Amino acid sequence: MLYILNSAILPLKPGEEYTVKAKEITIQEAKELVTKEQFTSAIGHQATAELLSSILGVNVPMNRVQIKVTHGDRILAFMLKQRLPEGVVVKTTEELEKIGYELWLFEIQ
Amino acid sequence: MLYILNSAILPLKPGEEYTVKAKEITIQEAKELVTKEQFTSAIGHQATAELLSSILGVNVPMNRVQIKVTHGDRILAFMLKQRLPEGVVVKTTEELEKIGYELWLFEIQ
């Protein structure tokens, strides 16, 4: 399964050791990824869901659930370029854009 | 550098593709790790710093800073077993223990 996550987290299923491939990708590559297979959003902030929906051209719901990844899964991760103060949630796509972000693809094996 | 992080985040330096090895470890293995080489804490919640200091027997400061990892670095990650509501910070080691956690070692190459 391809998961879309709102941070660069690697929520691995216990019981196994893993090798993870990681690379940064463009918006267009990310768009192609989420267009050509089923994805599961675990995006947990409204503004992040709104921004990802816009840049990817698909419905990225705000779905604040715990997911675990295991062998064969992939993660599209939205990685904000700064660390936020404790408890702070960025409420606008405008602020997310000014802070800046990277899109990463993690492939779990 | 060995970093101690308060979530299972993989804050990779852009400009390169990576292979990351990941496995769960015991408290004793984690203790040995942080005892035998220099570490840099980026723990960003008081209760998590207090808990890690206790279980590892070393000073794990609360140091809420952005760090990036690259080839040759390792991460000791504290991974809480549940996802928290938006903006919520767990304020007691007692609650962290009841939720439960895993310690993961990520080796970045």
Numbering used by the authors:
A (entry chain A), B (entry chain A): 1 to 109
Show passages lifted from the paper.
AFV3-109 is the most conserved protein in different families of crenarchaeal viruses. The structure of AFV3-109 is a five stranded β-sheet with loops on one side and three helices on the other. It forms a dimer adopting the shape of a cradle that encompasses the best conserved regions of the sequence. Although the function of AFV3-109 cannot be deduced directly from its structure, structural homology with the STIV1 protein, and the size and charge distribution of the cavity suggested it could interact with nucleic acids.
